[PDB]
């Protein structure tokens, strides 16, 4: 649908080891009347990374949900993924900036939208593998969307987990212990990560309170990090309750952080509990 020549670069939205997102204007009439869009491309395109990117594109294209960033199309000379542009950006940066304006009732509305997005994923047998507030996007004051799917895998038909160990840098501080020790990824490791996302929110993204900073303090400030992490978690070492967090929200977090994969709640039970807590804060 999109031509490379009609896509004008406006700014960088985020750069990683394997990907980059840009704000661009798609202006086919060249009269500065096209819509601003978000454009994801590989930064150092391997052919494996390209094949993964093609699948990421096919995943996003197959998703249609209020809390999932919209697919617009592809563009090539090559491959670019064109998405809707969300003007408020990542929940992470948005929470950090507007922390004095965002109360707990709002945090739980975001939380509940993230669960519904995640339940819709698990419905297609997709495992996200990268739930973090940096990958959640703010559409408006009342709406968040899951906004990146670079690490998302389809479960095979005959299995409820997927095994994979990619080279380089893994977000280890959001990983369930069976993902660190066995490279096993399931709906339940996504639930583990969701618990860490909930922790993030309730910390209001206070610099020294992030999971990397907290687990590093607990371990002791290279390759040895994951080993010490694994041991800490097996001993039931865990992220502290955030400042001002209710016992009942922290209970949800700690339940998400069960070492017993099978004892972790489902996404729809998470949504029931959160929506129940929300109503007991309002009415």
Ligand X SMILES: O=C(Nc1nc2cccc(-c3ccc(CN4CCS(=O)(=O)CC4)cc3)n2n1)C1CC1
Binding-site positions for ATP read: 13-21, 40
Closer of 148 and 200 to ligand X (Cβ)? 148
CB of 131 to ligand X, least distance (A): 12
CB of 184 to ligand X, least distance (A): 23
Residues found near ligand X in the complex (CB under 6 A): 13-16, 19-21, 38, 40, 69, 83, 85-86, 89, 134-135, 137, 147-148, 150
Closest CA to 196 of 220, 217, 219, 213: 213
CA gap 209, 221 in Å, rounded: 14
Q: Are 242 and 256 in contact (CB under 8 A)?
A: no
Closer of 21 and 261 to ligand X (Cβ)? 21
Closer of 19 and 265 to ligand X (Cβ)? 19
- The residue from 52, 130, 148, 190 that is catalytic is 130
Which sign does the torsion angle of CA 257, 262, 268, 274 carry? negative
Crossing angle of helices 267-282/247-256, nearest 10°?
Answer: 180
- Cα-to-chain-centroid distance, residue 279: 26
Q: Is 130 a catalytic residue?
A: yes
CB of 74 to ligand X, least distance (A): 14
CB of 96 to ligand X, least distance (A): 12
Q: Are 132 and 193 in contact (CB under 8 A)?
A: yes
Closer of 89 and 242 to ligand X (Cβ)? 89
CA gap 150, 76 in Å, rounded: 18
Q: Are strands 7-15 and 126-127 parallel, antiparallel or unpaired?
A: unpaired
CB of 161 to ligand X, least distance (A): 24
Closest CA to 191 of 179, 201, 203, 206: 179
- Tell me the longest C-alpha to C-alpha distance in the chain: 62
- Cα-to-chain-centroid distance, residue 184: 18
Residue 119 has a CB neighbour count (10 Å cut-off) of 18
Burial of 72 (0-12, 13-18, 19+ CB in 10 A): buried
Closer of 142 and 276 to ligand X (Cβ)? 142
> Which residues have a catalytic role annotated?
130
């Amino acid at each position: 649908q999109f031509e490379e020549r009609h896509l004008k670069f406006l700014q960088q939205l985020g750069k990683g080891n394997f990907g980059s997102v840009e704000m661009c204007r798609y202006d086919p009439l060249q009269d500065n009347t096209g819509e601003v869009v978000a454009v994801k491309k590989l930064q150092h395109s391997t052919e494996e990374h390209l094949r993964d990117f093609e699948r990421e594109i096919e995943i996003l294209k197959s998703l249609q949900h209020d809390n999932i960033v919209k697919y617009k199309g592809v563009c090539y000379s090559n491959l670019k993924l064109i998405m809707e542009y969300l003007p408020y950006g990542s929940l992470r940066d948005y929470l950090q900036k507007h922390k004095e304006r965002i109360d707990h009732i709002k945090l739980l509305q975001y939380t509940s939208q993230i669960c519904k997005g995640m339940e819709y994923l698990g419905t297609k047998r997709y495992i996200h593998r990268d739930l973090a507030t940096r990958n959640i996007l703010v559409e408006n004051e009342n709406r968040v969307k899951i906004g990146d799917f670079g690490l998302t895998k389809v479960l095979p038909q005959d299995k409820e987990y997927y095994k994979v160990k990619e080279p380089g840098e893994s977000p280890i501080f959001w990983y369930a212990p069976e993902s660190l020790t066995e490279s096993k990824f399931s709906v339940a490791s996504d639930v583990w990560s969701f618990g860490v996302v909930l922790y993030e929110l309730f910390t209001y993204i206070e610099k020294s309170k992030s999971p990397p900073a907290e687990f590093m303090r607990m371990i002791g400030n290279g390759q040895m990090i994951v080993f010490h992490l694994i041991e800490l978690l097996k001993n039931n070492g865990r992220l502290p309750r955030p400042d001002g967090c209710p016992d009942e929200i922290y209970m949800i977090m700690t339940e998400c952080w069960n070492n017993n994969v099978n004892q972790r709640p489902s996404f729809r039970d998470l949504a029931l509990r959160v929506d129940q807590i929300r109503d007991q804060m309002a009415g």
